[PDB]
Symmetry: C2
């Protein structure tokens, strides 16, 4: 079965690591961090890895139940919540995943909305349940962030109106802050089972192996609750590529596919890239920053090549 | 002739095309009195997006634009006038043959979400809970402007890039006018909506619409509101990619349990992009979690579906 990519322009793609549209293609050859994100990880023959799942609505989302309000040193009102799988089934800690699928894969203060729909209904209200929602922050670097153990903590500005023992949903929206004290680092993984524990079942790190090459990212800018900053999240492949590769499950015929970024209105190749078996792109570029390219552009599979293939410089 | 196909995705791998939600259940309601003419999640079987439908899951019920003025509510809350652009930031051209900017909500209600702003050497930011009343006389996205309200009283900046991220509904009480089949007046109350995706309905006796249903969060109050889409967003995205020619007006599809290979039920998938089934009851369809629709063959309007 022939390998293919979807025909989607950048303006038709979304981030696989946070629910955002793709804004720009991006390189950073001088990146010092090990790149080992866990969302947006899929092999070219369609094997999801890390914490990756198919739903755009599942990325950095949680489902579970608040247990009780808890004490915490930091500002705000804090709440412990057990987490289940996104489909509501109990998360089985013995499953070979780093954490429940969809769990955030970076250090930071993730800002969003906690909402609740009570289990118990009221006869006088037409047998309908009570609801509430509030802004919330999940600090993924916190010792209380233990999604692999089945529970996490979130903070609210709201001081009281969060109910114990009721079905709870976290909808991600952005970051609370990127001040130094908020520990945003998109390449630093959470400790999924808590401080001092080793993460397990990780999707592997990715890196260029060929001289002059660097990773190519699909970049999205992420909203902020407050403060200064223009934070970005870089994914290895957009969510639609994850979904496509999973559907197709085309056999990988080598370790590296040659792909061309094409302007369809002209049919011309803007640049070429290597699409690696483990699901990431490299290009021959020696600068950092956005790739400035016509809006109609998209990647097209050209051929399977090998480790010795030399890319045309961008 | 390129063979027609549907993606192989279970219900638990699908999302709603009318609000950013996972699909929870398949659902029927034969006694529905309303005309069903939603504008998001509309796509013909040969891949033509219609209504306000666009491809991004992040675009559904989202807005992009800039705040122009603050107006205080007579009672409580603060309202903000927002000019809206296309989701890609280009100016919305009201003369384009669309009902409203693509992604615009397609129902009456108080849509709850978050407004965020990143100012035009690091930029200042703010975000707040916000509500967009799509039934409001000030909801005129086809004219390039809408209004949203905040509990926040002051900290929303004018002339700065603004994003609305939808989250759920503010309320479904009597005063909140939630009706998933009532279209907004995209240009205001005395103006006719234009360029709409057509209404959908069974045409054969004993049939009813089959919906992909999602439950939508609430900011407060009582309720268990749901949003029903005609096809999930992944089907829209698939049909658009494939652009397979439609060989009749109606495709026969089978809902299959792959683990047994057995057909659980069959359905008509109509050219304009919606399903009907032979069912005479309302409520969820109880089906194994591994189930998904598979194209069987092209049939016609007179085909008799096996009763569910
Ligand atoms: C029914 C009530 O609606 C309000 O908005 C909520 O704040 C309460 O917790 C409760 O659910």
């Amino acid at each position: 079965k022939p390998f293919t990519l979807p025909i989607l322009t950048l303006g038709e793609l979304t981030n696989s690591r946070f629910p955002l549209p793709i804004d720009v293609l991006y390189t950073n050859p001088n990146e010092s961090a090990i790149v080992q994100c866990q969302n947006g990880r899929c092999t070219l023959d369609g094997e999801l890895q890390g914490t990756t799942q198919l739903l755009p609505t599942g990325i950095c989302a949680f489902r579970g139940k608040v247990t009780q309000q808890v004490q915490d040193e930091h500002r705000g009102t804090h709440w412990n919540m057990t987490v289940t799988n996104l489909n509501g089934t109990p998360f089985d800690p013995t499953e070979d995943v780093p954490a429940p699928l969809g769990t955030p894969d970076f250090s930071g203060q993730i800002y969003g909305v906690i909402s609740q729909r009570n289990t118990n209904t009221v006869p006088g209200e037409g047998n309908l349940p009570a609801n509430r929602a509030h802004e919330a922050v999940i600090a993924t670097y916190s010792p209380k962030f233990t999604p692999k153990l089945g529970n996490i903590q979130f903070s609210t500005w709201e001081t009281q109106d969060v109910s114990s023992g009721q079905p709870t949903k976290f909808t991600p929206v952005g970051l609370a802050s990127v001040d130094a004290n908020s520990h945003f680092d998109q390449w630093t993984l959470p400790s999924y089972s808590g401080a001092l524990t080793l993460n397990m079942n990780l999707a592997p790190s990715v890196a260029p192996v060929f001289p002059g090459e660097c990773l190519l990212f699909f970049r999205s800018f992420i909203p902020l609750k407050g403060g200064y900053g223009n934070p970005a999240i870089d994914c290895l492949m957009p969510q639609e590529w994850v979904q496509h590769l999973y559907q197709e499950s085309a056999p990988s015929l080598s370790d590296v596919a040659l792909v061309r970024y094409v302007n369809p209105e002209t049919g011309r190749t803007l640049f070429e890239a290597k699409l690696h078996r483990n699901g990431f792109l490299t290009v021959a570029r020696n600068s950092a920053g956005p790739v400035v390219a016509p809006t109609n552009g998209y990647f097209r599979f050209d051929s399977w090549v090998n480790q010795f293939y030399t890319l045309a410089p961008m």
